[PDB]
Amino acid sequence: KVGRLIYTAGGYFRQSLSYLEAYNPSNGSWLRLADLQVPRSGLAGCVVGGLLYAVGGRNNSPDGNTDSSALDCYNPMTNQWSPCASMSVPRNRIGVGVIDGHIYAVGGSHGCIHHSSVERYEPERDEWHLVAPMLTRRIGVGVAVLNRLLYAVGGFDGTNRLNSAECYYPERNEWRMITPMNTIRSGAGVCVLHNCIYAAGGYDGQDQLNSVERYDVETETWTFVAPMRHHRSALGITVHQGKIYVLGGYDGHTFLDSVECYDPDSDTWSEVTRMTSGRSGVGVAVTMEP
Numbered sequence: 001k002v003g004r005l006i007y008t009a010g011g012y013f014r015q016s017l018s019y020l021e022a023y024n025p026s027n028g029s030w031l032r033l034a035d036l037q038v039p040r041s042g043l044a045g046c047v048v049g050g051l052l053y054a055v056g057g058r059n060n061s062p063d064g065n066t067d068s069s070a071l072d073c074y075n076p077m078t079n080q081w082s083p084c085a086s087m088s089v090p091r092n093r094i095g096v097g098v099i100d101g102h103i104y105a106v107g108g109s110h111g112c113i114h115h116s117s118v119e120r121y122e123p124e125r126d127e128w129h130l131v132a133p134m135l136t137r138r139i140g141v142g143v144a145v146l147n148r149l150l151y152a153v154g155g156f157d158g159t160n161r162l163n164s165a166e167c168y169y170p171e172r173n174e175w176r177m178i179t180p181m182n183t184i185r186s187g188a189g190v191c192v193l194h195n196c197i198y199a200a201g202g203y204d205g206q207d208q209l210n211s212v213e214r215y216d217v218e219t220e221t222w223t224f225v226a227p228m229r230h231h232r233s234a235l236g237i238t239v240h241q242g243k244i245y246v247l248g249g250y251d252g253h254t255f256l257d258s259v260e261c262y263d264p265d266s267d268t269w270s271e272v273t274r275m276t277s278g279r280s281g282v283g284v285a286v287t288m289e290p
């Protein structure tokens with residue numbers, strides 16, 4: 001369990017970014033690691049087998065906006081990125097989750113197209129295949145996995161921001177609606193802690209949010225917990241040693257460098273570190289130090 005870092009990849013400030021940086025909660029240090037081969041914002045990060053994956057996004061640059069179908073793999077042992085097989089379609093503002101060593105890519109946008117499609121990556125075979133699509137088109141969708149079920153939360157369907165959510169049951173290759181959130185959220189951070197799916201922040205169509213609510217998969221209720229100190233949309237999120245960490249985002253005025261940490265035992269947030277520069281739309285995941 002020792003030696004794990006919080007990795008943040010890509011993001012946005014003025015343009016899409018190629019940064020890969022890793023925070024050590026044990027000593028407060030940040031490390032700058034190998035840049036992404038292509039700058040990307042609106043991507044998602046995940047880890048399988050100790051390897052860090054960067055999935056989808058968009059390269060917003062002065063000379064273009066290119067939505068990404070890319071899957072790239074970072075090995076901390078080598079400090080090198082390697083391309084993997086690309087997805088069927090570009091997916092900006094994507095959500096991803098891992099079930100039993102397989103990466104699920106959910107939703108996202110391609111130009112004005114809002115995807116309901118979903119595809120699954122097999123790392124050993126380096127292949128993507130489409131699975132059943134969601135019941136709703138969703139970009140800026142939050143995704144997390146609990147008890148080998150995959151949850152897609154909120155987002156934007158092309159017309160409305162959403163409080164709805166749904167769950168994918170792999171053995172039936174089927175999606176079902178779950179209880180909707182209390183709050184409309186696009187671009188929230190979604191993660192799993194204990195027996196709940198948490199949705200932190202986002203944009204409700206009017207303001208960036210500091211509220212946080214959690215879905216109890218047993219009781220099927222959404223309950224608010226303590227709000228974050230900072231309102232933020234397009235934040236990064238992960239869980240580490242029983243606590244939630246939120247990284248960066250946009251508060252309506254500033255691209256935040258703030259990293260906050262939620263303690264579920266006390267139901268409190270605290271500010272634990274700052275990123276090296278403010279940014280939004282990062283991918284985040286946890287694995288061993290390089």
Ligand SMILES: COc1cccc(S(=O)(=O)N(CC(=O)O)c2cccc(-n3ncc(C(=O)O)c3[C@H]3C[C@@H]3c3ccccc3)c2)c1
Nearest residue numbers: 012041042058092093140156186187203233234250280281
């Ligand atoms: C002012 O500049 C910025 C401020 C913050 C972030 C960024 S971003 O570069 O990181 N980026 C932006 C990109 O992909 O082009 C991005 C990435 C992931 C999630 C979201 N996100 N969060 C809420 C909503 C919403 O409006 O419902 C959306 C975004 C998708 C939805 C949207 C966009 C346009 C019109 C309607 C709806 C955005 C830029």
